[PDB]
């Protein structure tokens, strides 16, 4: 339908927002999140949207072209766990992102992690969030 007034107009009406060609931005509403890719911008690839600026959204859907799902589980999709998530990050992100440094240092970090808790408290969600945030 009229996606423009439904999603974009509230998203740009109030604040002057920067935009760069090829970037995808997420708009939440209607019990769903919609990813909009900036096909073209003027006068250059970098621009700032203003009330007088024209917005054209009459084209067909665009493919993902190897882009990652912006709705994938992340640290922002997990709530009620800040201390535990901090411990998990400190254990995991440092070696996985920087394995060369750890193998050069010679110190052995822990590898066995056990998330225990009542059903429905996360666990599966936390692991997916960590994996998606580390790309491992």
């Amino acid at each position: 339908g009229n996606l423009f007034d439904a999603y974009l107009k509230p998203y740009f009406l109030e604040a002057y927002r920067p935009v760069r060609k090829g970037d995808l931005f997420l708009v939440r509403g209607g019990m769903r999140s919609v990813e909009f890719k900036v096909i073209e911008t003027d006068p250059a690839e970098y621009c700032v949207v203003a009330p007088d600026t024209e917005i054209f959204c009459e084209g067909e859907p665009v493919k993902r072209e190897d882009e990652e799902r912006l709705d994938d589980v992340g640290y922002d999709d997990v709530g009620g766990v800040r201390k535990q998530m901090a411990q998990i990050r400190e254990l995991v992100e440092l070696p996985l992102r920087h394995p060369q440094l750890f193998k050069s240092i010679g110190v052995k970090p822990p590898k066995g992690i056990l998330l225990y808790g009542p059903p429905g408290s996360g666990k599966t969600l936390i692991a997916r969030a960590v994996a998606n945030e580390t790309g491992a």
């Binding site: 193998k103 050069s104 240092i105 010679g106």
Partner: protein, 107 residues
């Protein structure tokens, strides 16, 4: 049976040059404390180390760390021969390199 043949054992100090001998054995061999001596083990390996007094050790035994034992290719319970070598001379230059496996990474 010789006064210079001794059974290696575990050491106290972890330095790679200090070797502790029972003062009785050193006096028997007429060895000056804190001087240089030469130790021969198995095969044909030998090392040069500074000796020291330690009454805890026994006369028929000498205490060395794993480094010196590895250099001598001798395990615990083996026998080594000790010879006084106070004539050791200071070296003008030494070319030393690390090992690949141990130095992997750090550069």
């Amino acid at each position: 049976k010789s006064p210079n043949r001794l059974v290696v054992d575990e050491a106290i100090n972890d330095d790679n040059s200090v070797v502790s001998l029972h003062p009785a054995t050193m006096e028997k061999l007429q060895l000056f404390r804190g001087d240089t001596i030469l130790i021969k083990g198995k095969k044909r390996k030998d090392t040069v180390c500074i000796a020291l007094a330690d009454e805890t050790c026994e006369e028929p035994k000498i205490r060395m760390n794993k480094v010196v034992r590895s250099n001598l290719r001798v395990r615990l319970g083996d026998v080594i021969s000790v010879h006084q070598c106070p004539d050791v001379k200071y070296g003008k230059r030494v070319h030393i390199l690390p090992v690949d496996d141990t130095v992997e990474g750090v550069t």
